[PDB]
């Protein structure tokens, strides 16, 4: 009987296919989980980078201000020195 | 001699702004995690379709 | 009739399987879309980081140059002061 | 007293170079988007295979 | 005139520490590559199930 | 015969479904490969960022130290100058 034999073949193929499709979707789902974790990891890294880079920007900004004030003080002090030397 | 010419130029700070990118990545991570949960149920559904036929 | 009954079972299983496979691939496709968007987002973030970090590197480079010149000026000015003090 | 010893060391700037990484991520994002388009058609094809049998 | 008041404040260096994140991304990349290898075999298995029936 | 006809329909549908499922998993697998490569790329980028940002932090730290020492030297030198001016 070709109908019974064909049905046997089709049932075996369907079950093998579904077993492998289940396994393949399970592997894909593991990949999606790994990707989700990786994206959280990248977000955390970006937050750390933003933090430290802007702290260093702040530090440069403040150092430039301190330096401008220190050099202005030096200029005034040396000006007074040269004025007194000119009086002497 | 004379008073030295001392110049320190004005510093113009560019801010690194990653807030939108950080939020976007957090949202994408959450979307993928939800999808994982939905896919587990779909996988179970497919697994339930295996046939146990007799002849 | 076992052939008709088995065919009924196999058809119901095939249709349920395909419906769930369609839904699962649709969910996977959503995940791939989210990942594509995330990768663009990371590229944009890296471009911003590269920009700001190299600007801060430039700033440090230029500040070191300005400082070297300012301190050379101070050294020369103080040298002249000490020379005049030695003459006095 | 005397003239101060003033030293500022030479600065050696390391450049952050992410151009290759940025391009790579842009290309990967484009590849995934194209795949999404192809997969939509494949999903429709699978959906078309549902049977409507009568006995 | 007088001696200038020169002040440079103590610098407190925050270290950028991405070692855990780097390792995590390397591990995730390795996991996905292994999964790709396993999925190729599963795809071949599914492809082997096509039927060649005669009536 | 409805059994033979239904079997023909079911076999054609199964084969079309499996062909498209194979193609879809192949596309998903390509996406997973692209994602794996992208995650390696992000790891490399983070390593570069960590390197350069901490070098710039080191540079700022060392520059602050050099500056403190240079300004202390200037303070002492100018102090001696003003002491000698007061003696004169």
- Distance (Å, rounded) from C-alpha B55 to C-alpha B53? 7
CA-based angle F28:F29:F32, to the nearest 5?
90
Contacts of D45 in chain C (CB under 8 A): none
- Distance (Å, rounded) from C-alpha E19 to C-alpha D27? 26
Residues 6+ apart with CB under 8 A from C13: A14, B49, B50, B51
In chain F, where does DSSP find H-type helix? 2-87
* A62 touches B12 (CB < 8 A): no
* Helices B19-47 and C2-87: angle between axes, nearest 10 degrees: 160
Q: Evaluate the CA torsion angle F39, F44, F50, F53 in order and state its sign.
A: negative
Best residue in D1, D12, D44 to probe F by mutation, most F CBs within 10 Å? D1
* A57 touches B16 (CB < 8 A): yes
Report residue B11 CA to chain centroid gap.
33
Question: Which tokens belong to E40?
Answer: 């190729």
Question: Which tokens belong to A58?
Answer: 């702040």
Contacts of F84 in chain C (CB under 8 A): 85
Best residue in D2, D11, D19, D30 to probe C by mutation, most C CBs within 10 Å? D11
- Distance (Å, rounded) from C-alpha A23 to C-alpha B23? 33
> Phi/psi at D3 (nearest 5 deg)?
-65, 135
- Quick one: C39 exposed, middle or buried, by C-beta within 10 A (0-12, 13-18, 19+)? buried
Residues of chain C contacting B, Cβ within 8 Å: 2, 6, 9-10, 13-14, 16-17, 20-21, 23-24, 27-28, 30-31, 34-35, 37-38, 41-42, 44-45, 48-49, 51-53, 55, 59, 62-63, 66, 70, 73-74, 76-77, 79-81, 83-84
In chain D, where does DSSP find H-type helix? 19-47
- Distance (Å, rounded) from C-alpha E42 to C-alpha F20? 14
- Distance (Å, rounded) from C-alpha F47 to C-alpha E22? 7
- Quick one: A16 exposed, middle or buried, by C-beta within 10 A (0-12, 13-18, 19+)? middle
Instruction: Inform me whether the C-beta atom of residue E47 falls under 8 Å from chain A C-beta atoms.
Output: no
Nearest to residue A21, comparing CAs of C31, E48, C32, D33?
A: E48
| Declared resolution, Å | 1.9
Left (φ > 0), alpha (ψ -120 to 50) or beta: where does A57 sit? alpha
The DSSP code for D48 is: T
Nearest to residue C29, comparing CAs of F17, B42, E49, D49?
A: B42
DSSP-based three-state secondary structure for B12 = coil
Nearest to residue B25, comparing CAs of A50, C55, A57, E31?
A: A50
> Phi/psi at D7 (nearest 5 deg)?
-135, 130
DSSP-based three-state secondary structure for D2 = coil
Report residue A1 CA to chain centroid gap.
65
């Amino acid at each position: 009987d070709v109908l019974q034999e064909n049905q046997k073949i089709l049932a075996a193929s369907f079950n093998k296919a579904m077993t492998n499709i289940v396994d393949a979707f399970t592997g894909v789902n593991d990949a999606i989980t790994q990707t989700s974790q990786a994206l959280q990891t990248v977000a955390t890294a970006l937050n750390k980078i933003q933090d430290v880079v802007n702290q260093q920007g702040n530090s440069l900004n403040h150092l430039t201000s301190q330096l401008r004030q220190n050099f202005q003080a030096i200029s005034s002090s040396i000006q007074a020195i040269y004025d007194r030397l000119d009086t002497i | 001699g004379g008073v030295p010419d001392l110049v320190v130029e004005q510093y113009n700070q560019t801010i690194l702004n990653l807030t939108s990118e950080i939020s976007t990545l957090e949202n994408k991570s959450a979307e993928l995690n939800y999808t994982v949960q939905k896919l587990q149920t779909l996988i179970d559904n497919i697994n339930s379709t295996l046939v146990d036929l007799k002849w």
